[PDB]
């Protein structure tokens, strides 16, 4: 059924994520020494423009280690292209603490007896309130071009729309603000060049009754998250749209 692999990370990254059901994302460092570093979804928020100031402050206070600070420095310092430096690996289910910790991720999983996915409130959205019987979930990276800092958006959403093209048809409505700013940057700055606005990655299928809200506590700094109580994973590719 499920397929797993064993991964190694520094202790600083594990401090916030210890509960199993977190996503595992592998970032591509520009430097060749820490060429690949495994960051969790929570680490994306502190550089995400859709999070709240309170949660951003909490995440800033959580991470202290030089590895985590260097991960943030790499995430900010690159040429604004995030998804070109990221590959996702699914969901995690193991606890193995240590100075160099081991965590196991399910690249393809449907666990037979609780396995869940953890998404924070700031990162979570849904197009339709009409909860369909079966819901797919997606990861969207949003690229605004209003300023030189190139503020990115990092979203995880659940939707009953099965066909990707209709999903883009509906996504281009709200993210039309991306398209306008993209064209504005294309005219205003002749020199720097963009690739796209948004990227869609599909991983999962779960029922609407599995969508619960839950709290998380490590370092005592409380976080509110959405919990997909029986989520199964199926990794897709990073697929670009404008």
């Amino acid at each position: 059924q499920a397929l797993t692999a064993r991964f190694f990370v520094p202790e600083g990254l594990v401090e916030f994520e210890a509960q199993p059901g977190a996503l595992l994302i592998r970032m591509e460092t520009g430097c060749d020494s820490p060429r690949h570093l495994y960051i969790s979804l929570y680490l994306l928020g502190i550089r995400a423009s859709n999070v709240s100031a309170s949660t951003r402050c909490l995440l800033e206070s959580v991470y202290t280690a030089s590895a985590a600070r260097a991960a943030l420095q790499w995430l900010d310092l690159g040429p604004h292209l995030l998804h070109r430096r990221l590959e996702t690996l699914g969901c995690v289910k193991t606890v193995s603490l240590g100075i160099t910790s081991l965590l196991t991720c399910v690249m393809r999983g449907y666990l037979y007896n609780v396995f869940a996915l953890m998404i924070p409130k700031d990162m979570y959205l849904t197009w339709e309130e009409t909860r369909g019987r079966l819901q797919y979930v997606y990861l969207i990276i949003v690229y605004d071009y209003d300023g030189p800092e190139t503020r990115p958006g990092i979203y995880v959403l659940t939707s009953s729309i099965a066909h990707w093209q209709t999903l883009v048809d509906v996504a281009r409505g709200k993210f039309a603000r991306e398209r306008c700013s993209f064209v504005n940057r294309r005219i205003t700055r002749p020199r720097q060049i963009p690739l796209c606005t948004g990227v869609i990655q599909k991983l999962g299928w779960c029922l609407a009754d599995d969508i619960h809200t839950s709290f998380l506590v490590h370092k005592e700094l409380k976080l509110s998250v959405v919990r997909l109580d029986n989520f199964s994973v199926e990794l897709g590719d990073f697929r670009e749209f404008v």
Partner: protein, 292 residues
């Protein structure tokens, strides 16, 4: 969740209809919900087919609809089976389109054809099991391309010019068959598709490598061939070193151009559902691998 779907009929069934059902085994039928148990009214495309709302609307509804294969049908129990990704299945084609080995299959609303019958099969008084067409990639993307070209051209034109334009455009021949688009209508769906196409074409005009605009003309100065004669003939209706060259700029510009092209491309491409590797010598059925 469900590997089995049970459909049941409210009507009493005749043995002729039971024979037709047991003949239609291994065919493809669409389902709106992907659910355990459905009534027979919400099976097929007769539910959605209002010809006033043209082909684009029905295509948009059908591409969101889920698909299933037919199975152990008996007296008032259909038992449809939803195929999962990657397994090898036997599927029976129902349209007149010829299937040949190695082609990828796509789902589209049925088109018109020569024998003019349309065969009002399985009429349960009013309900009538209209079944979609499963089409290989070239013809299906031809339908999509011709519809998009139809919408792009037809705007701001009189019906007289459009008459000849649609009389040439609506008719498609593929492997010496003769099909025609049932209902070309300019809905908001096609209008948004054209909005995307226009934005994509503008972007590819903007960010494209400066030399790729003039590569055709440099080659025309270099060469003279039937392909290039036609290429020049297209551009003719509006008719040395580069002072700088930097590989990084070209790499970034072509990456952006590929992003824009892939944005424009899938306005025509249909997500393949089946890939064939078998054919009955009577073209009546094929063995396929499912794509999701």
């Amino acid at each position: 969740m469900e590997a089995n779907i049970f459909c049941t009929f409210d009507h009493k069934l005749s043995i002729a209809d039971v024979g037709k059902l047991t003949k239609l085994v291994a065919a493809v039928v669409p389902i709106p919900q992907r659910l355990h148990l459905i009534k027979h009214y919400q099976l097929g495309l007769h539910q959605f087919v209002d010809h006033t709302r043209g082909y684009v609307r029905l295509r948009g509804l059908l591409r969101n609809m889920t698909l299933t294969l037919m199975r152990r049908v008996e007296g008032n129990q259909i038992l449809l089976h939803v195929p999962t990704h990657g397994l090898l299945y036997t599927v029976l084609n129902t349209g007149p389109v010829t299937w040949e080995k190695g082609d990828a299959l796509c789902v589209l609303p049925p088109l018109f054809h020569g024998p003019l019958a349309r065969e009002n099969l399985l009429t349960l008084g009013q309900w009538e099991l209209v079944l979609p067409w499963i089409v290989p990639m070239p013809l299906a993307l031809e339908i999509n391309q011709r519809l998009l070209i139809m919408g792009l051209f037809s705007l701001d034109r009189s019906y007289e010019e459009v008459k000849a334009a649609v009389q040439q455009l609506q008719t498609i021949t593929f492997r010496d068959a003769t099909f025609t688009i049932p209902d070309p209508v300019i809905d908001q769906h096609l209008l948004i598709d054209m909005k995307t196409a226009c934005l994509s074409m503008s972007m590819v005009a903007n960010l494209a490598s400066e030399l790729t605009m003039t590569y055709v003309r440099k080659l025309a100065l270099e060469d003279s061939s039937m392909l290039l004669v036609k290429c020049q003939e297209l551009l003719m209706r509006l008719d040395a070193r580069p002072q700088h060259v930097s590989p990084d700029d070209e790499i970034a510009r072509l990456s952006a151009l590929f992003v824009m092209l892939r944005q424009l491309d899938d306005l025509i491409r249909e997500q393949v559902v089946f890939t064939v590797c078998d054919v009955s010598p009577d073209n009546k059925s094929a063995t396929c691998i499912f794509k999701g």
